[PDB]
């Protein structure tokens, strides 16, 4: 098991999923097409902003 962790803006949470275009999914963090795992996302407005 591995665990990648980071924080992104809400509108970009769609780009994380496998095979998508844009700034985040092509210049910052790209998941392999053949992914096998999960993804998690919970609003952290008070903690992180």
């Amino acid at each position: 098991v591995y665990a990648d962790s980071f924080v992104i803006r809400g509108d970009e949470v769609r780009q994380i999923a496998p095979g998508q275009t844009g700034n985040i999914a092509d210049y910052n963090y790209k998941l392999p097409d053949d992914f096998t795992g999960c993804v998690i996302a919970w609003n952290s407005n008070k903690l992180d902003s």
């Binding site: 496998p18 095979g19 998508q20 097409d33």
Partner: protein, 49 residues
């Protein structure tokens, strides 16, 4: 391959590939039946000759 995203790109190109495999299978089956007919006719020429 280009427009559709990776999760369902396959849910489409497997459709195409199995369709073309079915077309090849139909052609091959037709040829096996026709060749059997010809061989039936070919053995009526060896006997006549």
């Amino acid at each position: 391959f280009s427009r559709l995203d990776p999760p369902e790109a396959e849910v489409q190109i497997d459709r195409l590939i199995t369709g073309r495999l079915q077309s090849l299978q139909t052609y091959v089956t037709q040829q096996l039946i026709r060749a059997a007919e010809i061989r039936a006719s070919a053995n009526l020429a060896a006997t006549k000759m």
